[PDB]
Amino acid sequence: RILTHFYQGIVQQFLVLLTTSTDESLRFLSFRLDFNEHY
Amino acid sequence: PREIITLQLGQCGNQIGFEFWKQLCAEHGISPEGIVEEFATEGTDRKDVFFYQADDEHYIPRAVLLDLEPRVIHSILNSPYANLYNPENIYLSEHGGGAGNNWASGFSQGEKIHEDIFDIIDREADGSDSLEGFVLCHSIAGGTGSGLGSYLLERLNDRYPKKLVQTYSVFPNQDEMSHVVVQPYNSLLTLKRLTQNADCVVVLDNTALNRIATDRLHIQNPSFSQINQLVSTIMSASTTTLRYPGYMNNDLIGLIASLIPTPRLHFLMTGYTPLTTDQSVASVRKTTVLDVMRRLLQPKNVMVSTGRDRQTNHCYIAILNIIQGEVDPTQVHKSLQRIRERKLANFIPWGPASIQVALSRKSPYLPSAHRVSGLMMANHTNISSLFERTCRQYDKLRKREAFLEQFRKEDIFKDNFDELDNSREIVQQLIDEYHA
Amino acid sequence: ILSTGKYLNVVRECGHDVTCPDAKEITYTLKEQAYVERIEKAYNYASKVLLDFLMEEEELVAHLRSIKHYFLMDQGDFFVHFMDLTEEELKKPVDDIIPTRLEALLELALRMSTANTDPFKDDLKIEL
């Protein structure tokens, strides 16, 4: 359970930096990651 | 996001909501069984605010329809608009009810089907993680819509406390008292629940319907097939900021927040002028916005039976004037310029008033993108005349020994009649006190 | 001469085949207002092909529509959702990964309440 809590904090830290868009088709990359975790 | 669940209930509440959903497909450019037009996304920029969000571009209605009478639902499935409705969200085939005509019937039937009535209507609640609220599209006439509708105004107040409640309720007819005689009893029992167990209402009088139904509509025998035409347009007119893309008060908690002065003062007067099809041949010459709101404050389009000589000591506090479609917005501030010169609205002497005007583009359709439409949501303090009309018909009936022995056999042991009388007079006294 | 001169450099940047003449060669009468006739002949074709170019393809009307929707703030269905999400993240001092999560909420709501067209509204970059 501590490792699942470590895992979910990494994937939250993933999607934050993936929404930190520098915009050279980075809007395309931020589109794909919220689609995976929610759908 | 902004998903609202409509609670269609009763013999009259199911029919006024049936053509309300039927009105929405003609303006969204969609069919109830398919998508044949591409006008749904390029013309309309928002569709998932009253419908359920799509799984196959099939916008399911977020609607529930319960009634004791099976006659209102058997006139639905043969119509080709019932395939848009789902036979698993509310009921499957052969749904029934009571016998049945009583206010105490549906008031006692709410806690015996308590497990099933809070099971399938809550499945649509968690579809969106930010629920707007609940609108009880119910009736006051009869014992079907008034008996069961008073129960859900109590148990949804604490189970869903952070949600907006506001209803488009229709008032019954007070012409003669032969077919129904239980009309003063079931109306005032629901009217108490509409003020303290409910935030806002939208009143819709029945004696004011045939005032308009013979005004320009030219009928000789008044039928029930005309009651759905005045009601379904102003329902879709009230959500034009909410369905179509608007900016300010584009939510249902936006419009109602800017009009209610205080709790137990929420009865809003409604007005809607354009209902005639032969006006279409002369709207080609740029009919402007400068003449459409001069007749809204003039008591001609009102749907509330009120006194004509009682408006001098009463004062408007909040008045809404909604223009739709083609507005020509370079003269919409010009229309609001002419309001202060006439002073057709009496203003409250203790505080400021407000004439709020808003606009939104209508459907990409030829009767909609050509003719000007004006929706009024007034709030005037002459609404106690209806409350004086209902109370004078209430205490006169209790002195005639009418329905005091025929009404207290089931689930009524104490006299709750003056519990409704004082709370109604509390509304009538705080209205006149509100202008100091 | 320079306003038509800086003009011709842009049309060369569009393409080499697209030039502005419309061939008004041998010119320059000895007499006095020779200049201004050749000024308007170049300036009125500068009126021509740029009504042809930018309104048709480079879409200054369609850019300025979406320019007027997110600073002058029309299209208030998508907009009020993202201002609620921006308010939730700006009620505290920001951390390092917080601006990246702010940028993830921008294009999320674009396909929630749809705009006029969604891959054209990707010109919005977030700053503080």
Which 3-state string (H, E, C) describes chain C?
Answer: CHHHHHHHHHHHHHCCCCCCCCCCCCCCCCCCCHHHHHHHHHHHHHHHHHHHHHHHHHCHHHHHHHHCCCCCCCCCCCHHHHHHHHHHHCCCCCCCCHHHHHHHHHHHHHCCCCCCCHHHHHHCCCCC
Distance CA C81, CA C77 (A): 7
The single-letter DSSP state of residue B257 is G
Q: Which two tokens stand for residue B71?
A: 């006659």
Cα B394 to the center of its chain, rounded Å: 24
CA distances from B128 to B3, B194, B243, B341, C117 (A): 7, 27, 17, 47, 24
Q: Least CA distance to B248: which residue of chain C?
A: C76
- Contact at CB, B247 and C116, closer than 8 angstroms: no
What are the backbone angles phi and psi of residue B192, rounded to the nearest 5°? -70, -40
Distance CA B339, CA B238 (A): 23
The single-letter DSSP state of residue B292 is T
The position carrying tokens 């917005």 is B329
> What is the per-residue burial (b if ≥16 Cβ within 10 Å, else e) of B136-150?
bbbbbbbbbbbbbbb
DSSP bridge pairs for C127: none
CB of C68 within 8 Å of a chain B CB? The answer is no
Distance CA B252, CA B254 (A): 5
- DSSP code per residue over A1-39: -HHHHHHHHHHHHHHHHHHS---SSHHHHHHHHHHHHH-
CA distances from B343 to B272, B290, B315, B321 (A): 20, 16, 11, 15
Known binder of ligand: residue B127?
A: no
Say if residues B348 and B318 touch (Cβ distance below 8 Å): no
Element holding B320 (H helix, E strand): strand B316-324
Say if residues B178 and B103 touch (Cβ distance below 8 Å): no
Say if residues B398 and B404 touch (Cβ distance below 8 Å): yes
Distance CA A6, CA A3 (A): 5
Least Cα distance to B8 among B80, B71, B64, B87 occurs for B64
Among the residues of B183-273, which ranges form H helices?
183-193, 209-213, 229-238, 240-243, 252-255
Task: Give the angle subtended at the CA of C124 by the CAs of C119 and C127, to the nearest 5°.
Answer: 155
- In chain C, which among 75-94 make CB contacts under 8 A with chain B? 75-77, 79-81
Helix axes B384-398, B417-433, angle to 10 degrees: 150
CB of C113 within 8 Å of a chain B CB? The answer is yes
Nearest to C97 among A20, A23, A27 (CB): A20
Instruction: Show contacts of B277-286: CB within 8 Å, 24+ apart.
Output: B279/B371, B280/B367, B280/B370, B280/B371, B283/B370, B283/B371, B283/B372, B284/B370, B286/B328
CA distances from C67 to B175, B271, C73, C79 (A): 58, 37, 9, 14
* Residue C22 preceded by cis peptide, ω within 30: yes
Element holding B429 (H helix, E strand): helix B417-433
What distance in Å separates residue B39's CA from the closest CA in chain C?
A: 13
Rg (CA), chain A: 12
What distance in Å separates residue A2's CA from the closest CA in chain C?
A: 23
Helix axes C98-110, A2-19, angle to 10 degrees: 70
The strands making up B63-66's β-sheet, listed across from edge to edge, are: B63-66, B3-9, B131-135, B164-168, B200-202, B267-272, B373-380, B316-324, B354-360
Known binder of ligand: residue B149?
A: no
Do strands B131-135 and B164-168 pair parallel, antiparallel, or not at all (unpaired)? parallel
- Contact at CB, B45 and C76, closer than 8 angstroms: no
- Contact at CB, C103 and A17, closer than 8 angstroms: no
Known binder of ligand: residue B147?
A: yes
Do strands B131-135 and B63-66 pair parallel, antiparallel, or not at all (unpaired)? unpaired
Distance CA B35, CA B344 (A): 47
Distance CA C79, CA C114 (A): 10
> Count of B–C CB contacts within 8 Å?
28
Least Cα distance to B276 among B367, B360, B208, B359 occurs for B367
Distance CA B403, CA A36 (A): 63
- Contact at CB, B1 and C114, closer than 8 angstroms: no
CA distances from B426 to B268, B434, C101 (A): 18, 12, 52
Distance CA B394, CA B185 (A): 7
- Contact at CB, A23 and C99, closer than 8 angstroms: no
* Residue B105 CB contacts under 8 Å (≥ 6 apart), including other chains: B68, B98, B99, B143, B147
Cα A7 to the center of its chain, rounded Å: 12
How many other C-beta atoms can be found within 10 angstroms of the C-beta atom of residue B119?
Answer: 10
What distance in Å separates residue C103's CA from the closest CA in chain A?
A: 5
* Residue B142 CB contacts under 8 Å (≥ 6 apart), including other chains: B10, B11, B12, B101, B172, B180, B186
Q: Which two tokens stand for residue C74?
A: 């029309």
* Residue B371 CB contacts under 8 Å (≥ 6 apart), including other chains: B274, B279, B280, B283, B287, B325
Cα B189 to the center of its chain, rounded Å: 19
Do strands B3-9 and B131-135 pair parallel, antiparallel, or not at all (unpaired)? parallel
Cβ neighbours of B246 in C, within 8 Å: 76-77
Distance CA A27, CA B366 (A): 39
* Residue B414 CB contacts under 8 Å (≥ 6 apart), including other chains: none
Q: Which two tokens stand for residue B352?
A: 């400021």
Do strands B267-272 and B200-202 pair parallel, antiparallel, or not at all (unpaired)? parallel
Nearest to A16 among C97, C107, C111 (CB): C97
Task: Give the angle subtended at the CA of C79 by the CAs of C77 and C83, to the nearest 5°.
Answer: 130
- Contact at CB, C114 and B46, closer than 8 angstroms: yes
Distance CA B304, CA B383 (A): 8
DSSP bridge pairs for B64: B7
- DSSP code per residue over B1-12: --EEEEEEESTT
Q: Is B324 helix (H, G, I), strand (E, B) or coil?
A: strand
Instruction: Show contacts of C68-71: CB within 8 Å, 24+ apart.
Output: C69/C115, C70/C121, C70/C124
Say if residues B89 and B122 touch (Cβ distance below 8 Å): no
Q: Which residues of C touch A (CB under 8 A)?
A: 97-108, 111, 122, 125-126
- Contact at CB, A30 and C104, closer than 8 angstroms: yes
The single-letter DSSP state of residue B373 is E
Known binder of ligand: residue B10?
A: no
- Contact at CB, A20 and C105, closer than 8 angstroms: no
* Residue B288 CB contacts under 8 Å (≥ 6 apart), including other chains: B328, B331
Evaluate whether chains A and B are touching (3 or more beta carbon pairs less than 8 Å apart).
no
CA distances from B14 to A13, B65, B66, B164, B166 (A): 50, 6, 8, 21, 17
What distance in Å separates residue B239's CA from the closest CA in chain C?
A: 13
* Residue B357 CB contacts under 8 Å (≥ 6 apart), including other chains: B293, B321, B322, B323, B332, B335, B336
Q: Using CB atoms within 10 A of its CB, is residue B297 exposed (0-12), middle (13-18) or buried (19+)?
A: buried
Known binder of ligand: residue B353?
A: no
Say if residues B370 and B283 touch (Cβ distance below 8 Å): yes
Cβ neighbours of C101 in A, within 8 Å: 15-16, 19-20
Distance CA B207, CA B171 (A): 9
* Residue B14 CB contacts under 8 Å (≥ 6 apart), including other chains: B8, B65, B67, B72, B73
Question: How crowded is the C-beta side of C108, counted as CA atoms within 13 Å?
Answer: 26
Least Cα distance to B302 among B171, B201, B202, B208 occurs for B208
Distance CA B143, CA B175 (A): 18
- Contact at CB, B1 and C75, closer than 8 angstroms: no
Distance CA C90, CA C113 (A): 22
* Residue C56 CB contacts under 8 Å (≥ 6 apart), including other chains: none
Say if residues B306 and B382 touch (Cβ distance below 8 Å): yes
* Residue B246 preceded by cis peptide, ω within 30: no
Q: Which two tokens stand for residue B304?
A: 């509330």
* Residue C84 CB contacts under 8 Å (≥ 6 apart), including other chains: none
Nearest to C77 among B41, B46, B248 (CB): B46
Helix axes B183-193, B417-433, angle to 10 degrees: 60
